[PDB]
Amino acid sequence: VQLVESGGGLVQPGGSRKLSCSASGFAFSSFGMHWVRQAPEKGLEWVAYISSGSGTIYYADTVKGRFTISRDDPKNTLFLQMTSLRSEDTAMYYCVRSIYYYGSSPFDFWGQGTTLTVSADIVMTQATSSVPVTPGESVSISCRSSKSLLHSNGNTYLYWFLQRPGQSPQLLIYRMSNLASGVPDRFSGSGSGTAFTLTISRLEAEDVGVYYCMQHLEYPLTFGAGTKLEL
Amino acid sequence: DQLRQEAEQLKNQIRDARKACADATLSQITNNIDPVGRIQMRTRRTLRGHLAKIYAMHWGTDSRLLVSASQDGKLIIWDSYTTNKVHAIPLRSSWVMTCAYAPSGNYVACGGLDNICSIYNLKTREGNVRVSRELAGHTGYLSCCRFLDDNQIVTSSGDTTCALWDIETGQQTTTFTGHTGDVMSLSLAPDTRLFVSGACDASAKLWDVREGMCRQTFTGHESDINAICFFPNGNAFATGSDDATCRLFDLRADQELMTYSHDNIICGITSVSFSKSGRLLLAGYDDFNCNVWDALKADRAGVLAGHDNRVSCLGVTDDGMAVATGSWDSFLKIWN
Amino acid sequence: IAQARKLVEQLKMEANIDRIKVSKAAADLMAYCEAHAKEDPLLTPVPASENPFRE
Amino acid sequence: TLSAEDKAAVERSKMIDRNLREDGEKAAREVKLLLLGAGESGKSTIVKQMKITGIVETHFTFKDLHFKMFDVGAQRSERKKWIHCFEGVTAIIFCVALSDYDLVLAEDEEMNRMHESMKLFDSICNNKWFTDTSIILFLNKKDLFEEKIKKSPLTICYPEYAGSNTYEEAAAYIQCQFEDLNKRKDTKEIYTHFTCSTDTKNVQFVFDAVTDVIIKNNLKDCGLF
Amino acid sequence: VFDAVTDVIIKNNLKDCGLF
Amino acid sequence: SMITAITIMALYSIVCVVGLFGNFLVMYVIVRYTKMKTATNIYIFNLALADALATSTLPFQSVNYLMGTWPFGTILCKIVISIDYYNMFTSIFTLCTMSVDRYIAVCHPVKALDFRTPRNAKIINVCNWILSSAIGLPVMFMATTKYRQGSIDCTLTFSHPTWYWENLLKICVFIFAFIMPVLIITVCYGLMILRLKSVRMLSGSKEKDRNLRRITRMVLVVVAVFIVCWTPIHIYVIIKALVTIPETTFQTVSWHFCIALGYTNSCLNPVLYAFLDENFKRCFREF
Amino acid sequence: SMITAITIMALYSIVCVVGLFGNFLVMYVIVRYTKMKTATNIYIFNLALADALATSTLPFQSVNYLMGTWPFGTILCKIVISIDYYNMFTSIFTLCTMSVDRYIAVCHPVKALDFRTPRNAKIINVCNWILSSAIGLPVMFMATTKYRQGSIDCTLTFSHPTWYWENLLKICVFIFAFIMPVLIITVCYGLMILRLKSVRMLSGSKEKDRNLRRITRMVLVVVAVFIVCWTPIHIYVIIKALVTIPETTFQTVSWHFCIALGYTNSCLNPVLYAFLDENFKRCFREF
Ligand SMILES: CC(C)CCC[C@@H](C)[C@H]1CC[C@H]2[C@@H]3CC=C4C[C@@H](O)CC[C@]4(C)[C@H]3CC[C@]12C
Ligand SMILES: CC(C)CCC[C@@H](C)[C@H]1CC[C@H]2[C@@H]3CC=C4C[C@@H](O)CC[C@]4(C)[C@H]3CC[C@]12C
Ligand SMILES: CC(C)CCC[C@@H](C)[C@H]1CC[C@H]2[C@@H]3CC=C4C[C@@H](O)CC[C@]4(C)[C@H]3CC[C@]12C
Ligand SMILES: CC(C)CCC[C@@H](C)[C@H]1CC[C@H]2[C@@H]3CC=C4C[C@@H](O)CC[C@]4(C)[C@H]3CC[C@]12C
Ligand SMILES: CC(C)CCC[C@@H](C)[C@H]1CC[C@H]2[C@@H]3CC=C4C[C@@H](O)CC[C@]4(C)[C@H]3CC[C@]12C
Ligand SMILES: CC(C)CCC[C@@H](C)[C@H]1CC[C@H]2[C@@H]3CC=C4C[C@@H](O)CC[C@]4(C)[C@H]3CC[C@]12C
Ligand SMILES: CC(C)CCC[C@@H](C)[C@H]1CC[C@H]2[C@@H]3CC=C4C[C@@H](O)CC[C@]4(C)[C@H]3CC[C@]12C
Ligand SMILES: CC(C)CCC[C@@H](C)[C@H]1CC[C@H]2[C@@H]3CC=C4C[C@@H](O)CC[C@]4(C)[C@H]3CC[C@]12C
Ligand SMILES: CC(C)CCC[C@@H](C)[C@H]1CC[C@H]2[C@@H]3CC=C4C[C@@H](O)CC[C@]4(C)[C@H]3CC[C@]12C
Ligand SMILES: CC(C)CCC[C@@H](C)[C@H]1CC[C@H]2[C@@H]3CC=C4C[C@@H](O)CC[C@]4(C)[C@H]3CC[C@]12C
Ligand SMILES: C[C@@H](Cc1ccsc1)NC(=O)NC[C@H](Cc1ccc(O)cc1)N(C)C
Ligand SMILES: C[C@@H](Cc1ccsc1)NC(=O)NC[C@H](Cc1ccc(O)cc1)N(C)C
């Protein structure tokens, strides 16, 4: 399983650029595909989504119309077509695979990210920007929401992502209670609508990074500002 | 000569011990308890898309996921609450007579006329349900298989043999032999230390997983046995046969506790199961109907209809909320 | 003769097993079912809100 | 009402519904054939003619019609318990070898291969699961039958046949004796073909017999039959 | 004279077609 | 005067009551029990639906002759004439399609697997309603009410030249609803019987041979009933267009009697196509 | 190999050059001099227009055989196939309409006054283009490019079942462009000759009798040329559909030679219908 993006570099504003991400080591045709952007000094932000089989397409309101997302299943490549890029699009664009079924773990594998430089609705809230921490103490991380994410089927759609500096963000907890494949038991999520908590039992040096919260109740998807740990 | 005549004497000694241990018929003792009465179950979900003859289903332990085996070569894993299909597993051999779902939910088994038990990994990183292990070395058709663990599984086969399989190693650790007829079903006890298997010699033999030998043999039935299911405590098991009877055997008492014979139904029993309490015995029949048998009053609590062809399989879920019965008309119907 | 000898030795172990009274066996079935009677969703129909299967 | 995953979960289920119906329509077009007979009949031979543990599945395409042939000879189990599986089959290919009258069975008790094959055909033809299914009968090894019938007569193995020792008469007599085992002749045809390492004529015979079964199905589908 | 009047119309129609 | 009026009105009434009874009874059994799971039964449902709509036109036609005028008004006159012509072509094209269905079923069995599917049966049936719409929609426009001797007349008025377009429609109804369907029905069923005689299942024993006879007789009656019903109405319109005929008591009955035979096929299409099928016979025997 | 290629390409070239010359020359003389003031000349203009568009398809077909592939692309493939089928039906229906025109002109002279007007001629011609649109528009959709052995092929792809709809279109082209027009042309011109013999203007003196002969011969050639041209192309498609035939050098020429005869009628329609008319002969004599 590997996702590598290509098509970056400096782009003139109002120009056109077509990104391509090649998928290897997994069945591309069965996963839905996301684009997520990250400003150099700001948190994550969702761009677009195409489902498996191209059955539905969603965009954020601030990227509606200008961006075009497509996918090719025989060649296993995700294509993002961009028209009239503005000065706010200077962000690193990630490719994400997401399968959706009962018990699935979507947003599990993230791409590497393509740097793009241009030269000229539920809102997730982070209480603290940065708390200094030491290895061996419990770390309480809290994200709050503008809407109760508790759906009637009992599934609360909150995703905890960790982005280590200089690395891709990785899924930790999916649907606020379930640990993703490869995540240690020390991470644990709890809470309800409008009030969530992330805990780390025995903090490690590799756990240091930026912790994001993402709702998945309705589109567009909105990331938190993030919480940064330092030693 | 002398050995086989001694076996006749030892068999008569067991028959003497059975007649001596029995004093009061079960139907006489349970007369005090009031009958459960008419129990009406309405169809809640109808699962469509098999397009072929269903043979087996198995519930998940979360009481929501269930796998189903059809003759188009497709294992379909179902979301029972929302009617959605979770997975569609393409099979190499279309002829598959059984399917198992692991208690952890990681693996799915199937088996049939190809004599190969195939284990399917569901939580792989690639996202497509691929073959983890193909278990081989049965001379007869696989009829039933149940996961003890993610690494251990007991399969029944048509070579009169059951076996304990190591999934990681790929070979049979314990071989269970001694059936005079082809084994057709197996059920795991809740502690999973013991299992019982019914064969085509009208016998149901208790097997110990760790030891590997036959502890007890039950010979109540007449022609041949198609189904077997443990009682929830782990001491009793009702058995379904092809003589229009269902018999309940106790491990400790070592006798037939009760028989379920009703006159107008002469067809056979494909599948049996117990409710969460154990008060209801739900048996799939060949008369296109599932009859709900009271465990202790020996009556017909309810009748399930609506299946065009004979109900191949029937499993009652873990918490006991729903009952899904599979039939040969490519419809799974969930009864609550 | 040799295969029949294995059958006799197996049949010996089946004879030498302790057994409990049928009426005592009857008591175990009655006790377990009555304890779990209200827990069973099939004996007592669950209210539709708590019932996960709905129209 | 449905959440964002629940709509995608239904969408995944609809794509699976599209995949299953395409496989279901493809499977309905594909002709399923059951291969039966003794081990020394020449199951292995007749499969190789049409191409050129458990189930051996043979896929061959003749005149834009896909055939599935299921060889069940490897299984040692009792057939009565799994014979119910092949109910929805188009035709039964039942192969026996004509030269088996001379041959003696492996079992110590005296027995006749012809009498075993007739009882093998009797349980298949009179089966409750095979009432609407026609049987494509193959009589194999007629060239070995031709040599053996000159040296050794058919009268010796059972006194019932009083016909003269002729190759054409004996092969015709063995043919009808299998057809006399049929107890429901109106709704079940027996398609008999003499095979001695023959070419595409064997495939053509099967295709001709299957074509009448598809006519029999379509006439039932129309309701006229 | 109706036959004669019709006869002229036939000649006019044949000249209309260009055949005559 | 009066006995003639009671004879013609009962003639429509017998055709209407038996026609509405048979057609809706076949659409009831299919939807309740069959539920259109079979390709052939889909065609029979479209046949019963087209016949029932055509049978629905009969009370309106009854009132028209009895009163001698059309009291229903212009907007319904547009609808009733449209339902008459459109569902005539729809019913007859369904007869052609089932002739094509039964031909491919026997003579071309391998390609019948592609043809005889419930998915394909729905597509070809919708095309039959679309092909009838090619004449159905212009009949909706052209139909108006014309005052003749103070009596409203519900009929198709044509653009100038009136004589050219009126006879041109009569030829198309003659060709596309009689001449071309007789070519479809006779040849496809005729070649079907030839193939069935070649098939060795129906040949052989007397019991198997007798089943060949009943299928051949059922096919021949199906061909005959289409010929017996639609031949008088088509030729008599042509004779009425070609040769002016004096109005007579016998001439008045003959016009409506030929109309009654046209709908009599629609009455007898449930009997032939639905009740005589062995699949439906199992349903009535069971239930 | 090479002599065969030069023979077929010249065969298309002779038909194309003479076809484009004749058709545009008739549309020139009518628009410049006649100015479509006469009912009959309107039909001849629509005949020359339909033939010229069909003749325009010939260089595209020429390139297709010579290169062995279609280099023009998918969007033009949709256009070129559409112009081929639509203007074939448009030309032949114009031949039918002029047969109907000349029938009404002689046999029904009183109603011909209503029929043979420049207002009515424009209406019936537009209907001919509309009737051809019923097959013209689906040909526009169904035509796509299919890669066969790395060679683009410009052909009509059909929905599943492919075998049913492909042969069904071949029957409609057989019936509506050959079988029904032969019925229109032979009967209407045949009854026309019978009426002309009854007319006493052409009977009588030898000079008047000779004019009856030239009209009858001109009618018979017009009937024959339609029969001689379109009979090989229609039957050979049916034989190719029914019986698989091995590809041969003679078989390859025969396919394109029957296509060439189909357009040869369109080449000879100016000669028969326009130049042989006495009205046009007065124009060339004067000018
Ligand atoms: C005013 C009406 C009569 C005009 C024609 C309406 C057409 C569009 C309607 C009338 C009959 C209808 C068909 C009747 C029966 C069936 C079989 C069913 O299993 C699928 C839908 C299908 C195939 C319908 C499709 C739509 C249909 C063809
Ligand atoms: C293959 C079968 C279904 C083809 C059937 C074609 C017939 C029924 C349809 C197709 C085109 C239709 C014609 C289209 C246009 C007109 C002009 C209008 O002013 C009178 C009706 C008339 C003349 C229609 C008569 C019926 C018609 C000829
Ligand atoms: C349908 C198209 C293709 C062919 C049309 C053929 C035309 C020329 C023929 C066929 C039908 C014929 C009409 C049929 C009936 C009548 C009534 C009669 O009292 C006067 C002549 C008249 C009005 C005919 C005139 C000529 C006619 C219109
Ligand atoms: C199409 C409608 C309007 C008219 C039908 C005309 C009929 C009589 C003609 C036209 C096409 C002809 C068919 C063309 C092709 C075949 C396939 C061949 O293997 C058997 C004969 C058969 C089936 C022909 C039978 C007669 C036929 C069906
Ligand atoms: C062969 C069978 C099935 C159908 C026969 C239909 C034709 C030939 C018959 C049935 C009705 C008959 C018409 C009935 C009434 C009249 C009116 C009368 O003043 C002249 C004769 C005439 C016009 C008849 C001509 C022949 C006729 C049209
Ligand atoms: C792409 C084209 C060929 C599709 C068909 C276009 C149709 C709408 C065009 C092409 C030929 C045109 C006709 C050609 C000649 C005439 C005679 C003239 O005095 C009046 C207009 C009239 C009657 C035209 C009407 C419109 C017409 C029928
Ligand atoms: C009176 C004359 C003009 C009528 C001519 C009718 C013919 C040419 C037209 C009218 C309706 C047309 C059909 C309409 C729909 C389809 C379905 C499409 O998937 C294949 C083409 C096909 C089958 C067309 C073939 C040509 C067609 C049959
Ligand atoms: C046009 C409608 C009304 C009638 C259709 C009649 C159908 C049943 C007939 C007429 C044309 C026939 C096709 C004509 C040609 C071929 C090619 C041959 O190698 C296989 C059979 C096949 C494919 C025929 C199958 C049956 C067929 C499709
Ligand atoms: C309409 C197309 C598709 C087919 C044409 C079929 C031809 C052969 C048939 C059908 C209608 C018939 C016409 C019907 C009416 C008349 C008027 C009469 O006074 C002379 C004969 C004449 C003119 C007939 C001649 C033959 C005819 C034109
Ligand atoms: C009567 C005149 C006007 C037209 C005659 C057209 C028909 C009968 C002729 C003209 C072209 C001929 C075909 C020319 C080429 C071949 C290929 C050859 O391998 C078989 C014969 C066959 C298929 C011929 C059959 C008959 C044929 C189709
Ligand atoms: C009284 C007449 C008009 C009418 C319509 C609806 S209310 C009143 N009704 C009719 O004539 N009905 C018979 C025709 C059959 C027919 C039609 C035209 C032909 O050229 C040949 C036959 N009908 C079945 C469509
Ligand atoms: C090469 C072929 C395809 C093409 C079209 C435009 S570029 C290439 N071209 C053709 O076949 N042209 C002959 C037909 C006549 C015909 C068609 C169908 C029939 O069933 C019978 C005859 N054309 C005049 C419409």
Tab-separated table of N, CA and C in Angstrom, chain F residues 12 23 33 56-57 69 80 87 120 173 182 195 240 242:
chain	number	residue	atom	x	y	z
F	12	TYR	N	-71.646	-4.879	-28.587
F	12	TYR	CA	-70.585	-4.146	-27.898
F	12	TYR	C	-70.515	-4.520	-26.422
F	23	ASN	N	-59.166	-9.285	-19.225
F	23	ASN	CA	-57.916	-8.525	-19.249
F	23	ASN	C	-57.448	-8.145	-17.848
F	33	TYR	N	-49.317	-12.881	-7.924
F	33	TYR	CA	-48.627	-14.156	-7.747
F	33	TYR	C	-47.292	-14.215	-8.483
F	56	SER	N	-61.558	-0.473	-22.936
F	56	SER	CA	-62.112	0.709	-22.273
F	56	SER	C	-62.735	1.694	-23.260
F	57	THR	N	-62.269	1.700	-24.512
F	57	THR	CA	-62.831	2.568	-25.543
F	57	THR	C	-64.255	2.153	-25.929
F	69	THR	N	-74.570	10.814	-31.543
F	69	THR	CA	-73.691	11.968	-31.437
F	69	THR	C	-72.681	11.690	-30.333
F	80	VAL	N	-60.026	9.622	-26.255
F	80	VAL	CA	-60.665	8.332	-26.527
F	80	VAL	C	-60.236	7.771	-27.885
F	87	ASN	N	-53.456	1.848	-28.588
F	87	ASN	CA	-53.478	0.535	-27.956
F	87	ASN	C	-53.867	-0.584	-28.915
F	120	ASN	N	-34.258	-7.913	-21.030
F	120	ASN	CA	-34.476	-7.652	-22.451
F	120	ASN	C	-35.961	-7.513	-22.763
F	173	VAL	N	-52.535	1.683	-41.393
F	173	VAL	CA	-53.242	0.774	-40.491
F	173	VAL	C	-53.403	-0.599	-41.139
F	182	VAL	N	-49.357	-10.210	-40.033
F	182	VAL	CA	-49.634	-11.539	-40.585
F	182	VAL	C	-48.353	-12.171	-41.124
F	195	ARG	N	-39.463	-26.643	-36.873
F	195	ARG	CA	-38.370	-26.989	-35.970
F	195	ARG	C	-38.822	-27.971	-34.890
F	240	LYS	N	-65.003	0.369	-48.102
F	240	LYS	CA	-65.739	1.605	-47.836
F	240	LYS	C	-65.009	2.820	-48.399
F	242	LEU	N	-62.779	2.672	-51.061
F	242	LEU	CA	-62.758	2.550	-52.517
F	242	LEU	C	-64.137	2.789	-53.123
